[PDB]
Amino acid sequence: DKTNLGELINQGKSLLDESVEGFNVGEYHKGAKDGLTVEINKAEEVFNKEDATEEEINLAKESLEGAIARFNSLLIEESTGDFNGNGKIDIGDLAMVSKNIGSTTNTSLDLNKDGSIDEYEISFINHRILN
Amino acid sequence: EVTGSVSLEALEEVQVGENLEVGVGIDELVNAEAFAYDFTLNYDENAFEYVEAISDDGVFVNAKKIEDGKVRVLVSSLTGEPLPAKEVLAKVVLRAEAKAEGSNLSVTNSSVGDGEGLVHEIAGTEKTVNIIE
Ligand SMILES: [Ca+2]
Ligand SMILES: [Ca+2]
Ligand SMILES: [Cl-]
């Protein structure tokens, strides 16, 4: 039985259909759509016929559900990049990214969730402040 | 108690059709370190047009025109170290369009952020420039 796996695949494709990457509120961080696509394809492979065992199907559902969660976590919100959490995005927030450039331990400052703080975060904060 | 002041350098005289690079930095910052810097450059749009903002590779710069004669600039360190004082951090490139005497260049609305994300105001500065034919 692959009904639920197929349902999750269709949820993922719908997220792709409806989403755009960019720097603005309601958009997703660069790479979000590529990442979700890789995971949908993994799930699609298991979905496609043959002798997939119920455990293979279950692992695939689990991984794709995690991928959907990760995609949603990459949604840019009003407060994204307001780090000290003082209600606005300003030069203090840009300074926090700068001080922490190269950090692999600051997993609230890692906006695109790629594992480190670099020019992406700098570029994002500059864009939000000025626009 | 944090105090500080902007630095501003440019040629004292340029001719119509020549670029004026206006170099902005931090003259002094007391009781804080700055990893990012937010300032506004004011100029006379009757004398100059705004072209772009540039920087050397230890610093990231983005700027946006607010209105004629007013450009907001953001500077941040790429080095893992604070922005240094007594160095040009960003240059705002203006282009001379018309003759002018004692045309004012001023930096206002200037503040810095520290490593912990705290913001501090710093004092602006001004100088004049002549545009000749
Ligand atoms: Ca903030
Ligand atoms: Ca990152
Ligand atoms: Cl400003």
Side-chain angles (χ1 to χ4, degrees):
Chain A
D1 177 22
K2 294 167 167 171
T3 305
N4 298 333
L5 178 55
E7 287 166 349
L8 294 174
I9 290 171
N10 289 347
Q11 276 187 30
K13 291 181 181 174
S14 295
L15 281 168
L16 288 175
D17 290 342
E18 295 170 13
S19 59
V20 60
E21 288 181 358
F23 279 140
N24 305 312
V25 175
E27 294 183 312
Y28 292 78
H29 298 284
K30 173 198 65 168
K33 293 187 75 171
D34 187 66
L36 179 56
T37 302
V38 168
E39 292 294 320
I40 291 164
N41 287 344
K42 285 182 198 176
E44 197 82 76
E45 289 193 295
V46 176
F47 183 75
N48 279 322
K49 308 154 195 62
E50 321 300 310
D51 37 43
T53 54
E54 57 164 317
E55 287 320 316
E56 268 176 314
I57 296 160
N58 288 342
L59 275 178
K61 287 196 300 172
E62 179 179 304
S63 298
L64 179 58
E65 182 68 355
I68 288 163
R70 177 174 168 92
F71 184 78
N72 291 324
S73 82
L74 294 166
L75 175 70
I76 301 162
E77 304 186 308
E78 282 292 343
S79 64
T80 304
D82 182 20
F83 301 122
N84 35 41
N86 70 337
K88 65 161 173 164
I89 302 144
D90 68 12
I91 204 67
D93 303 291
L94 183 52
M96 288 173 78
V97 172
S98 182
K99 188 267 155 54
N100 292 104
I101 275 199
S103 174
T104 53
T105 58
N106 275 276
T107 51
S108 63
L109 272 31
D110 183 16
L111 301 177
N112 69 170
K113 292 187 186 294
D114 68 350
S116 64
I117 309 311
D118 64 15
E119 237 172 70
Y120 177 78
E121 277 78 27
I122 296 284
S123 296
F124 177 88
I125 297 296
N126 276 263
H127 194 92
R128 290 283 316 262
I129 293 166
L130 294 170
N131 294 97
Chain B
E1 58 274 357
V2 173
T3 58
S5 60
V6 172
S7 64
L8 178 63
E9 62 90 20
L11 289 168
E12 263 139 50
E13 187 173 301
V14 57
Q15 66 167 232
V16 173
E18 186 179 4
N19 296 320
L20 181 70
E21 292 192 342
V22 179
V24 184
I26 294 164
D27 188 38
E28 193 191 32
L29 179 60
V30 185
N31 286 328
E33 303 193 303
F35 287 82
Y37 179 27
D38 180 352
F39 68 86
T40 293
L41 179 64
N42 303 284
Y43 63 91
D44 187 353
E45 189 85 35
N46 301 119
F48 293 103
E49 59 167 30
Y50 167 66
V51 177
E52 64 190 28
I54 61 179
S55 71
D56 292 350
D57 40 36
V59 303
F60 188 97
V61 177
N62 267 196
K64 185 153 194 175
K65 193 159 167 191
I66 304 314
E67 57 195 40
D68 282 353
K70 184 182 294 196
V71 172
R72 189 174 176 194
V73 185
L74 311 177
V75 175
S76 49
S77 174
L78 293 173
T79 66
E81 287 192 297
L83 293 166
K86 313 287 198 195
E87 294 186 22
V88 172
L89 297 174
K91 288 176 184 181
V92 173
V93 186
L94 302 180
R95 188 157 177 98
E97 296 295 323
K99 56 188 271 85
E101 289 288 291
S103 199
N104 285 201
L105 299 166
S106 65
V107 174
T108 60
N109 296 266
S110 301
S111 62
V112 295
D114 79 356
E116 279 276 58
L118 299 163
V119 175
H120 296 286
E121 310 281 352
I122 66 174
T125 197
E126 60 180 286
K127 77 173 305 208
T128 67
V129 59
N130 293 316
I131 306 180
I132 66 171
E133 68 305 310

